Every structure is written in C-alpha cells, then in structure tokens.
Amino acid sequence: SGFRKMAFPSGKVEGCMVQVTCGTTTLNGLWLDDVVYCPRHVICTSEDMLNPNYEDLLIRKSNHNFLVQAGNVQLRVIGHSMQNCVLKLKVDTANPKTPKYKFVRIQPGQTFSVLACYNGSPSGVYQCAMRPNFTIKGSFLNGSCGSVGFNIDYDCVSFCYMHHMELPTGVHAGTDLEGNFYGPFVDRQTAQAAGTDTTITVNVLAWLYAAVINGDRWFLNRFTTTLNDFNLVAMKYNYEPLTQDHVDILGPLSAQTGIAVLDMCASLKELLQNGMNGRTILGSALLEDEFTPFDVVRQCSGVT
Amino acid sequence: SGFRKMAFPSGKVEGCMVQVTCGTTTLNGLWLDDVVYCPRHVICTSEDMLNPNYEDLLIRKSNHNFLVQAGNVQLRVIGHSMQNCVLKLKVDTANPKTPKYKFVRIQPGQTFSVLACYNGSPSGVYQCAMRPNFTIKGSFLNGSCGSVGFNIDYDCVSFCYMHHMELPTGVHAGTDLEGNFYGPFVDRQTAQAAGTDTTITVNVLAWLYAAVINGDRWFLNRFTTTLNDFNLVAMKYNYEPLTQDHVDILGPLSAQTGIAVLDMCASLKELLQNGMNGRTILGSALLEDEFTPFDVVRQCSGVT
Ligand SMILES: *CC(=O)N1CCN(S(=O)(=O)c2ccc(C)cc2C)CC1
Ligand SMILES: *CC(=O)N1CCN(S(=O)(=O)c2ccc(C)cc2C)CC1
C-alpha cells in the first residue's frame, strides 16, 4: 500500500551519460553503442544563442573540437553529424554499458523519468509528464542540457526526451532522441510562450483509482455522468477532453475497483466544482495528473 | 530553475539488490562485500508472524536453507547470523558491484531515496522522509521487504533504511542496516499504532526558500516573528518545534535569498493561520516537508 511519484531505476541510463565540451560550453551527452547524442547548441557561445545558424557554426567544427569524457576517460570522436536539433558524435568505442534501448517520441500526457546530470554526472532522478502544451515541469540548472527522459520496459530503455531549453517562465523544452522538439519550441534565446497548461484528465482519473485502491475514498459520490456532460465541466476547468480511448485505457482500473469510469468522472466533476474543502487525496491537496493509467497499474501491481 | 521531489541516482544500489528465499518466503537482500543483509522475518511463515520467536525459528535454519540469487546466478551461503531484526548471510563471493558505503541511522526529518524492489529486481525509486513518528510514507507491496533507503555523498552510499513492515494504517516501518527499528515498531503482526505525524517545520522553511529561489514569492509578507512566538503557532498546527539549530541550518538559504529565517517563519505562520486560499507553491497546494535544507541547497546548486 501507499502510492508515490516513482521514477524508473536510473542505473541503465547512469551508464550512458558522458560530458560533451565544445569550445567553452560543457553539457551532457548520451552514449549508446558508438554514438554520443547531445544538444546541438553545444557548438554555440551564449552570444550565438540569440540567432544561431547551426549549419554555419558546425562548418567551423572538427571531430577533435568535440571533447567527450566518460568518467575520467576521453572518447575519440571519429565523426559528427547534425540530425535536427541533436549532434551525433561517432566515437571509436561502443559504450560497453549500452542497455537494450529504443528512441520513442511520446504523446502529451505520457510520463517519463529524468536523470538530471551536470558534467556527464547524474545528480538525481524524478518523474515528469509531457504537458499538453509540450513543456515539461523539470528541475534543470545550467549544465543540465543533454539530460534525458526515459521509460523502461523490463530490460529495454525507451529514450523519449533530451533537455535543451528553459523558457522565460521556468518551464522546460527539449527533443526526442531524433532531435525534434516537442511542441513549437526552437533552440534559440527568443520570445517563446507556452500555451495553456491543461490538466491530463485521464491521468487524474487513474490517480483517483490509485487512491481508492490505497484506501482514500472520501471523494467517491452517489453520482454518474456522461462523456459529453463531463467534457463540458473539463472544458470549464482547462482539463483535456476525455475520449472513449481514455475510458478504454481506464478499463483495467475500472475492473479492479468495481467503479465505472463514468462514476469516477462524476467524482472528479464534484471535486472540480466543490474543491477538496481542505481534505487531501494520497497526501496531495490538488488533483495529480502525472500518473498514467499504466503507471497506476505498474505501481499498484509491483512490475519490475 | 524548477524544483522537483528528486531521488539519488539508484544505479549503485541496483547493483547490490538480490533475492533471498527461505522456505516459501521470498524478499529482497542487500549484497555488500561478501554479506547479504535481509529482514529476519524471511524465516517466518505468515502464521509465524503473529508471535515469532526468531532465535527458535533460526535454530531450524542452515546456510543451505537461505537461497540467495543475484540476477539469475545463485550465491553460496557459507554462514548466517541474526543482528537485531536483520539476517547477515555470509556468501563465498564479494559483490563486485559493491560501492563505497556506510550504514547510518538517520534522525526524524531526514530524507532518503528508496529503491522499491520485488524478487531482488528494482521496480522504481522515490524520495521519502523519516517522519517524526518514525514511520515512512512509502509505496511497498508484498515482496518489497528488504528494499533499502539511502543517501549518496559523491561516491559513498549511506544506507539508512531497510523495509520490514506495513502498519494497519498503510504507513511503513523498518530498520537501519544494523537491524534496529526506527521508532517502537517490532517485526510482529500486532496492534502497532503510529504517533502524531507532525510536520517537519525546518523542511517546510527550506522548501519555502526553494520556492522564493524558483520565483514563487506570493506568500512573502511584511511580518517577522520570534522562535517562541512561531513555536506557539507550530504547536497549535502539529508542526515540530523550531530550534536555533534549525535556524543555523537554514543560514545558507537565508544568506542566498536575503530573507531572515524569522521573517520566513512569519510567512509560514500566516500560511498556517490563513491557508493557501487556493494558490499553490512549487505546484503544491500544501506545505511540503520532505525537502531538507541540504536537499534544497543540493538541488538548487546542481551537486553530483
Ligand atoms: C542548456 C545548458 O545546460 N547549457 C547551455 C549553456 N551552457 S554555457 O556553457 O553557455 C553556460 C551559460 C551560463 C552559465 C551561467 C554557465 C554556463 C556553463 C551550459 C550548458
Ligand atoms: C515484508 C514482505 O515483503 N514479505 C513478507 C511476506 N512474504 S510472504 O511470502 O509471506 C507473502 C505474504 C502474502 C502474500 C500475498 C504474498 C507473499 C509472497 C513476502 C515478503
């Protein structure tokens, strides 16, 4: 029992983190097989970052300008290419600690663990969600760029995020491991405003199931609702519209708890309309939206 | 910027987790050098757990009854002893992945990461605090016993917790790595009620500093208070008394922010007296007490 914001074990990713230095800029790289992945803004001066021409900046760079250090051992760079907003540094040594892995581009609402790193060294691990506005609400200081977001399926690390940007509002933007930004963000120091940070409704419902499973039940009510009725309330409260897909995804939690998804929606509806009245749900005074239905099943069943 | 509930990277502890089976009971062990540490209730039937005589139960056990598996490789047990509420299983092989480590008994209010494991396999990592009532609010299912709590200082893992018990109220009790329980808890299935779960006042203040540092300032007020005045309010709200020790510990955060500790106390006093009025602080609608001043400095400065 008990329910916690839980990150994947980070060991498999710890073994992949290196330091990339180009000129005076040091940040983190991901070493998988004989390639090191890093943010392309490693080639910029902070002067460059106002309106950088990456192709033009990269022409001035050779393999030997990219200083790649794995622990206190230097890797030999034997090639470099830009793919979207990442650099791929070909090194002469396959990472011996390379786990089974995939690159996946996640959808908004999907959760992942971040291994925050500085100078290729892990400092900590936390669980995030890709927000509906394609930001993440991270914890990233200068030198944390190249830190990666990931999921683990048993032995396979799915890398879904690399850290590039802090927006002027202190929220975070970055890329998949093909170096395409989530959302409309660019690796440029410019006016970049996030859209509406809406609540991930399906994640909130999953987390209400997790609460019932773990004994927190005070918010279960006598009511039900319809998808259309619920969605009217969700719109009003800047919650994502709930789809039949979401309902389907919540099926197993429905089945385990014997609470119909639409009943749980009516519980969520009353919470939105009436607030918590100073009560808490799983030690939170607001509606948590960074657990997926999959996250709830995993934690509540003890999958390794 | 941004501030997250952050666990230590778990890799160094991942490398220490094994499966211990005695009779029909499987749980987790910690393999450091040529010793495997596990909860002594591994020798119990759940029938035993009502009033177990561990010395008497252990007499019936031989080295070869303790089945220790590290990945899919069996370790040879060449000795066993009970130290308080843990078993030390001497194996014929030193754990090659043994990190630099210490056993430390932590104080209430101190924070640590848990690597939740099942069958010697890591499932996830989260950050806890040792509550003032010597419980932790964990996420532990059956098979999670032997999961460990730890801190890391650069290269040194300080193990502070091993998981043993869920109390009837779904909070968690366990031992240091010398197998002494935190609080008055016993490895027995009996009436065991937690005391008052008070709020860790110094941790809340640290977290208010973390908020100011990260731009959340709406709760800074025009007031100050005294330790004695503040402590009157803390008593009323089941907050731990604030000592000059706590004030001293908050000094660096005081210095960085230019907000006197006693001013921040008066801010906390108004929050206790007036509530958040539907506002949030670092994405929380209650006063977070599971960041230490040390945790705030570490995260806010990017220590690895
Ligand atoms: C994204 C990231 O973590 N970066 C990019 C900025 N550089 S830097 O070297 O230009 C730099 C900028 C500002 C400060 C205070 C310090 C540094 C090192 C670091 C990596
Ligand atoms: C503390 C812990 O995680 N334990 C102790 C209980 N045992 S068990 O094998 O007795 C057991 C009890 C109940 C269930 C549903 C399942 C098991 C395996 C597991 C380890």
Swiss-Prot record, chains A, B:
Residues 1-304 are cytoplasmic. Changing K90R: In strain: Beta/B.1.351. Residues 1-304 form the Peptidase C30 domain. Changing P132H: In strain: Omicron/BA.1, Omicron/BA.2, Omicron/BA.2.12.1, Omicron/BA.2.75, Omicron/BA.4, Omicron/BA.5, Omicron/BQ.1.1, Omicron/XBB.1.5, Omicron/EG.5.1. The active site is at H41 (for 3cl-pro activity), C145 (nucleophile). It is found in: Host cytoplasm; Host Golgi apparatus; Host nucleus. Inhibited by pyridone-containing alpha-ketoamides compounds 13a and 13b. In turn, alpha-ketoamide 13b (tert-butyl (1-((S)-1-(((S)-4-(benzylamino)-3,4-dioxo-1-((S)-2-oxopyrrolidin-3-yl)butan-2-yl)amino)-3-cyclopropyl-1-oxopropan-2-yl)-2-oxo-1,2-dihydropyridin-3-yl)carbamate) inhibits SARS-CoV-2 replication in human lung cells. Inhibited ex vivo by michael acceptor inhibitor N3. Inhibited ex vivo by compound 11a and 11b. There is a cross-link at K5, K90 (Glycyl lysine isopeptide (Lys-Gly) (interchain with G-Cter in ubiquitin)). It catalyses: TSAVLQ-|-SGFRK-NH2 and SGVTFQ-|-GKFKK the two peptides corresponding to the two self-cleavage sites of the SARS 3C-like proteinase are the two most reactive peptide substrates. The enzyme exhibits a strong preference for substrates containing Gln at P1 position and Leu at P2 position. Cleaves the C-terminus of replicase polyprotein at 11 sites. Recognizes substrates containing the core sequence [ILMVF]-Q-|-[SGACN]. Cleaves and inactivates human TRMT1, preventing tRNA guanine(26)-dimethylation of tRNAs. May cleave human NLRP1 in lung epithelial cells, thereby activating the NLRP1 inflammasome pathway. May cleave human GSDMD, triggering alternative GSDME-mediated epithelial cell death upon activation of the NLRP1 inflammasome, which may enhance the release interleukins 1B, 6, 16 and 18. Also able to bind an ADP-ribose-1''-phosphate (ADRP). 3CL-PRO exists as monomer and homodimer. Only the homodimer shows catalytic activity. Interacts with host FBXO22; this interaction promotes the proteasomal degradation of nsp5. This is 3C-like proteinase nsp5. The gene is rep. The chain holds residues 3264 to 3567 of 7096 of the full protein.
